[PDB]
């Protein structure tokens, strides 16, 4: 049972909204990063043709540049000020009990997913 409600509404949705003689063109299916690479290649081809007019782009020129002010440092596991960074582990930590309670007995492979939040892995 249970299927009567979903069956009825799905009957209402599925039967008009299309032009004469158009259907699925069975095109190649690509992910987004593929589209960024093809577009980058496209304005790359345009600029290499122009070099043989002035350089301008849309999706890459709206990219925010890195900041000139040095960013605030934070602890990796707690999130307060990282006064200290462990040499072996490359982990920002707040104080001593945080260090000996988390940073020392951390099970290996967790430091990379720690740095993955800051993208330093």
């Amino acid at each position: 049972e249970r299927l009567l409600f979903l069956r009825s509404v799905g009957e209402r949705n599925e039967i008009r909204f299309k032009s004469a003689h158009y259907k699925k063109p069975t095109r190649r299916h690509k992910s987004a990063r593929q589209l960024i690479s093809d577009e980058n290649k496209r304005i790359n081809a345009l600029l290499t043709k122009a070099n043989k007019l002035v350089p301008k782009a849309t999706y890459f020129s709206v990219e925010a540049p890195p900041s000139i002010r040095p960013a605030k440092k934070y602890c990796d596991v707690t999130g307060l000020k990282g006064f200290y960074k462990s040499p072996t582990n490359n982990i920002r930590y707040h104080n001593a009990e945080i260090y000996q309670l988390i940073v020392k007995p951390m099970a290996p492979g967790v430091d990379q997913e720690y740095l993955k939040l800051r993208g330093a892995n």
Partner: protein
């Protein structure tokens, strides 16, 4: 008994650009000061510019500017510029939460 006015400019050195206009001897200097209530800009003679140079003032330092006596006192580097290095000798001080331009009699 003498009456007197004290005019104080305070804040972080946002910009520092001495105009030379040689005819070595700078013509003047433009100085921007930043506080929590906003910022301002200041025009100064070369003598107080040299006195600024004798407090080792660079961009980001917090200074004390008095309008009449023309005395300069550095306070330290700003709190926003603390993490340029992990440990450095420069004393870090927060921004003045008041206005840049304070006056009293």
């Amino acid at each position: 008994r003498i009456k007197e006015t004290k005019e104080v400019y305070e804040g972080e050195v946002t910009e520092l650009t001495p105009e030379d206009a040689e005819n070595k001897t700078i013509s003047h200097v433009i100085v921007g000061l930043k506080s929590a209530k906003g910022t301002k800009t200041l025009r100064l003679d070369p003598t107080i510019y040299e006195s600024i140079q004798r407090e080792k003032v660079s961009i980001g330092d917090v200074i004390y500017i008095e309008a009449n006596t023309g005395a300069v006192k550095r306070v330290g580097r700003s709190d926003a510029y603390a993490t340029e290095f992990d440990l450095e000798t420069e004393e870090y001080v927060p921004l003045p939460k008041g206005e840049v331009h304070k006056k009293k009699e």
